[PDB]
Amino acid sequence: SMKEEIKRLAEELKEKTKNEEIKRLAEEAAELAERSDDPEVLEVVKKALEEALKSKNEEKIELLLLVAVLVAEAGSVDAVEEKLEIALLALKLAEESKDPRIIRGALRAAIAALRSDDPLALKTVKEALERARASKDERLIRAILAAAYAFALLAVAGASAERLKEAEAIVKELIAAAEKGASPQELVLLVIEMMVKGMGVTMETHRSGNEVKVVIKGLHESQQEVLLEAVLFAAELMGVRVRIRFKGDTVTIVVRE
Ligand SMILES: [Cl-]
């Protein structure tokens, strides 16, 4: 049957991985598929699991399993059309590009968007992925994806709705600046600014020579981890070397032009 094949695919996937979250999604997928009545759903789960088994990219596998869980938990592919379209966009961009940074940015932005279940984050990431696919500027694509990931991460972390609304103005500012040739270092500064705004903390910037020092005060340990994930991911995507210092509850992020 369809379900027995799906359970074997999930069983194989969950033993092959060392990633505990992929293991949990594989099991959730198998259980939801077991209870599924909709053959359209079962087809999508099977094709997601088969594709995951053929992949060596763990972010791609996470995205595919998230798709399978979403469709199977919903009962229909139509109920999750927007999330499905975001995942397809990311999967298309990931096979259309050879840059490992673009591949990783597309899949991670889509994963975070889907996990957020946040209307504004879903729409912003969908548009970012469309904009990246229409662009031939790989530098701009990498900046678009870094902004989209940081934004979706704020949503995943439960930023207040009003702080996320204001963070979207910084997404727009970053993308506009990138299109006008702004430096990778200034685009990283904008990702820092977006995170500081999204988390309700404060920042001061100090520039001397070719070094820019951003001092961020009032970060809790939970906020520290979210801000540094977005900022280090952005620095990896845009090829920026970043250094970090910590004293008390103060984080200092150093960028060199
Ligand atoms: Cl096999």
Numbering used by the authors: 1 to 257
Paper text:
To investigate the mechanism of facilitated dissociation, we focused on AS1, the design with the tightest effector binding (Kd,H:E ≈ 10 pM). We used X-ray crystallography to structurally characterize multiple states of our designed systems. For both the AS1 and the AS5 systems, the crystal structures of the hosts alone and of the host–effector complexes closely match the design models (maximum 1.3 Å Cα root mean square deviation (RMSD)). The unbound structures show an open hydrophobic cleft in the new designed state X poised to bind the effector, and the effector-bound structures show that binding the effector causes the two switch domains to register-shift into the designed state Y. Starting from AS0, we constructed a new state X by shifting the two domains from their state Y positions relative to each other (by one heptad along the helix of domain 1 that contacts domain 2), building a new loop between the domains, and optimizing single sequences that could adopt both this new state X and the original effector-bound state Y. This approach maintains the open cleft in state X by introducing minimal rotation from state Y and simplifies the multi-state sequence-design challenge by minimizing the local structural differences between the two states. Transition between conformational states occurs by a register shift throughout which the cleft could remain open and bind the effector.
